[PDB]
Design a protein around this nucleic acid. Structure first.
Length: 60
DNA sequence: AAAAAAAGAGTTGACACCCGGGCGAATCCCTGCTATAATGGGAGCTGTCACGGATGC
Protein backbone atom coordinates (compact mmCIF):
# COMPACT_ATOMS: atom_id res chain seq x y z
CA UNK A 1 0.00 0.00 0.00
CA UNK A 2 2.84 2.41 0.78
CA UNK A 3 4.53 1.63 -2.54
CA UNK A 4 1.30 2.07 -4.51
CA UNK A 5 0.53 5.34 -2.70
CA UNK A 6 4.03 6.74 -3.27
CA UNK A 7 3.72 6.29 -7.06
CA UNK A 8 0.06 7.35 -7.19
CA UNK A 9 0.82 10.58 -9.09
CA UNK A 10 2.69 8.69 -11.84
CA UNK A 11 -0.58 7.44 -13.35
CA UNK A 12 -1.94 10.99 -13.70
CA UNK A 13 0.74 11.85 -16.27
CA UNK A 14 -0.11 8.80 -18.40
CA UNK A 15 -3.89 9.18 -18.09
CA UNK A 16 -3.68 12.81 -19.24
CA UNK A 17 -2.61 11.71 -22.73
CA UNK A 18 -5.73 9.55 -23.16
CA UNK A 19 -8.65 11.99 -23.07
CA UNK A 20 -11.88 12.58 -24.99
CA UNK A 21 -12.05 8.91 -26.05
CA UNK A 22 -15.37 8.01 -24.40
CA UNK A 23 -14.24 7.79 -20.76
CA UNK A 24 -14.10 10.45 -18.07
CA UNK A 25 -10.90 11.53 -16.33
CA UNK A 26 -11.73 9.92 -12.98
CA UNK A 27 -12.52 6.56 -14.61
CA UNK A 28 -9.20 6.62 -16.47
CA UNK A 29 -7.41 7.51 -13.24
CA UNK A 30 -9.10 4.58 -11.49
CA UNK A 31 -8.14 2.20 -14.30
CA UNK A 32 -4.55 3.42 -14.15
CA UNK A 33 -4.54 2.90 -10.39
CA UNK A 34 -5.82 -0.65 -10.95
CA UNK A 35 -3.00 -1.26 -13.42
CA UNK A 36 -0.40 0.18 -11.05
CA UNK A 37 -1.64 -1.94 -8.14
CA UNK A 38 -1.56 -5.02 -10.37
CA UNK A 39 1.98 -4.19 -11.51
CA UNK A 40 3.40 -3.53 -8.03
CA UNK A 41 3.04 -7.21 -7.10
CA UNK A 42 5.77 -8.31 -9.56
CA UNK A 43 8.85 -6.08 -9.31
CA UNK A 44 12.33 -7.55 -8.82
CA UNK A 45 15.91 -6.35 -9.38
CA UNK A 46 15.93 -6.85 -13.14
CA UNK A 47 17.55 -4.67 -15.82
CA UNK A 48 14.99 -1.96 -15.09
CA UNK A 49 15.92 -0.70 -11.63
CA UNK A 50 13.28 2.07 -11.75
CA UNK A 51 9.73 1.14 -10.76
CA UNK A 52 8.32 3.68 -13.22
CA UNK A 53 9.89 1.92 -16.22
CA UNK A 54 7.99 -1.27 -15.35
CA UNK A 55 4.80 0.43 -14.15
CA UNK A 56 4.31 2.57 -17.28
CA UNK A 57 3.71 -0.51 -19.44
CA UNK A 58 1.05 -1.88 -17.09
CA UNK A 59 -0.60 1.53 -16.71
CA UNK A 60 -0.76 2.00 -20.48
C1' DA B 1 -91.44 -55.13 -65.55
C1' DA B 2 -85.26 -55.88 -64.26
C1' DA B 3 -79.49 -55.10 -63.22
C1' DA B 4 -74.36 -53.64 -63.08
C1' DA B 5 -70.53 -49.24 -63.41
C1' DA B 6 -67.95 -43.90 -63.73
C1' DA B 7 -67.48 -41.75 -59.51
C1' DG B 8 -66.90 -41.78 -54.34
C1' DA B 9 -64.18 -44.03 -50.62
C1' DG B 10 -60.40 -46.48 -49.04
C1' DT B 11 -56.23 -47.77 -49.04
C1' DT B 12 -51.29 -49.77 -50.54
C1' DG B 13 -46.88 -49.37 -51.95
C1' DA B 14 -43.27 -45.75 -54.40
C1' DC B 15 -40.68 -41.88 -54.46
C1' DA B 16 -39.35 -36.38 -53.76
C1' DC B 17 -37.87 -33.64 -50.20
C1' DC B 18 -36.85 -30.58 -46.47
C1' DC B 19 -35.35 -28.76 -42.39
C1' DG B 20 -32.87 -31.15 -37.84
C1' DG B 21 -29.12 -32.92 -35.57
C1' DG B 22 -24.47 -34.24 -35.66
C1' DC B 23 -19.33 -34.30 -37.47
C1' DG B 24 -16.11 -31.30 -38.74
C1' DA B 25 -13.21 -27.02 -39.62
C1' DA B 26 -12.25 -22.69 -39.40
C1' DT B 27 -12.13 -19.17 -36.84
C1' DC B 28 -13.54 -15.44 -32.73
C1' DC B 29 -12.78 -13.32 -27.61
C1' DC B 30 -10.11 -13.17 -23.18
C1' DT B 31 -6.37 -12.73 -20.65
C1' DG B 32 -1.72 -11.67 -19.61
C1' DC B 33 2.97 -10.13 -20.64
C1' DT B 34 6.18 -6.37 -22.64
C1' DA B 35 11.74 -4.11 -18.46
C1' DT B 36 16.55 2.65 -20.15
C1' DA B 37 14.08 7.39 -17.63
C1' DA B 38 9.00 9.00 -17.91
C1' DT B 39 5.53 11.61 -11.58
C1' DG B 40 -0.92 17.32 -10.02
C1' DG B 41 -5.74 19.24 -15.35
C1' DG B 42 -8.94 22.43 -19.46
C1' DA B 43 -13.48 24.68 -20.64
C1' DG B 44 -17.15 27.59 -18.59
C1' DC B 45 -19.67 31.77 -18.00
C1' DT B 46 -19.34 37.15 -16.97
C1' DG B 47 -25.19 41.45 -22.15
C1' DT B 48 -32.80 39.20 -18.10
C1' DC B 49 -34.94 40.13 -13.75
C1' DA B 50 -37.75 39.19 -9.87
C1' DC B 51 -39.36 36.42 -6.59
C1' DG B 52 -38.90 33.27 -3.16
C1' DG B 53 -36.73 31.52 -0.07
C1' DA B 54 -32.20 29.19 2.63
C1' DT B 55 -27.98 30.13 5.51
C1' DG B 56 -24.54 33.44 8.93
C1' DC B 57 -23.25 36.85 13.54
Amino acid sequence: KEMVEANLRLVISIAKKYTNRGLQFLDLIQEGNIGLMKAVDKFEYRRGYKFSTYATWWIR
